[PDB]
């Protein structure tokens, strides 16, 4: 269990880390842990159906890469349990 980068609220980041640790302990594949993370992280984030548009990102794998101007202070990309996992808000 380790994190590599996160621009986010500390309590939200720790909550995401706990949920990711639970999912990684539970789920198996890339799609399976991706789906569990994408679903279960949408609870503790209050989904505002207002004019703002945001989403979840799922990357649970060995080695890909990206570098984008994502949502400001709303993206956590960790690398835990020999699996990098990126999750960002949709710009």
């Amino acid at each position: 269990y380790k994190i590599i980068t996160s621009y986010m609220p500390e309590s939200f980041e720790q909550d995401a880390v706990q949920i990711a640790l639970i999912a990684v302990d539970k789920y198996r594949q890339l799609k399976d842990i991706a789906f569990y993370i994408k679903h279960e992280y949408d609870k503790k984030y209050p989904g505002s159906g207002k004019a703002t548009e945001g989403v979840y990102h799922c990357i649970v794998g060995k080695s890909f890469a990206s570098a984008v101007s994502h949502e400001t202070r709303q993206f956590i990309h960790m690398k835990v349990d020999t699996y990098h996992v990126i999750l960002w808000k949709s710009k």
Partner: protein
């Protein structure tokens, strides 16, 4: 270039599937390749997109309005959405 599945603006998708050769010949690393491809796609198509290129990474998340495909090029793939 190749593909796995597709539900997208196939005009923009099949335009990008041959325009990405410019960044593949241009850049020299998968991070920089994805950067130089997505910058060209954002200048070309619109100011809203999302692309994750490379391999050895999985994704199951909700898509955007009118773009969702896993379009590859010689096992160095792209996951494209708007």
């Amino acid at each position: 270039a190749v593909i796995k599945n597709a539900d997208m603006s196939e005009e923009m998708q099949a335009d990008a599937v041959d325009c990405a050769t410019q960044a593949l010949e241009k850049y020299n690393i998968e991070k920089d390749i994805a950067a130089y491809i997505k910058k060209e796609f954002d200048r070309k198509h619109n100011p809203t997109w999302h692309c994750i290129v490379g391999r050895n990474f999985g994704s199951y998340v909700t898509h955007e309005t009118k773009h969702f495909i896993y379009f590859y090029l010689g096992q160095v793939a792209i996951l494209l959405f708007k």
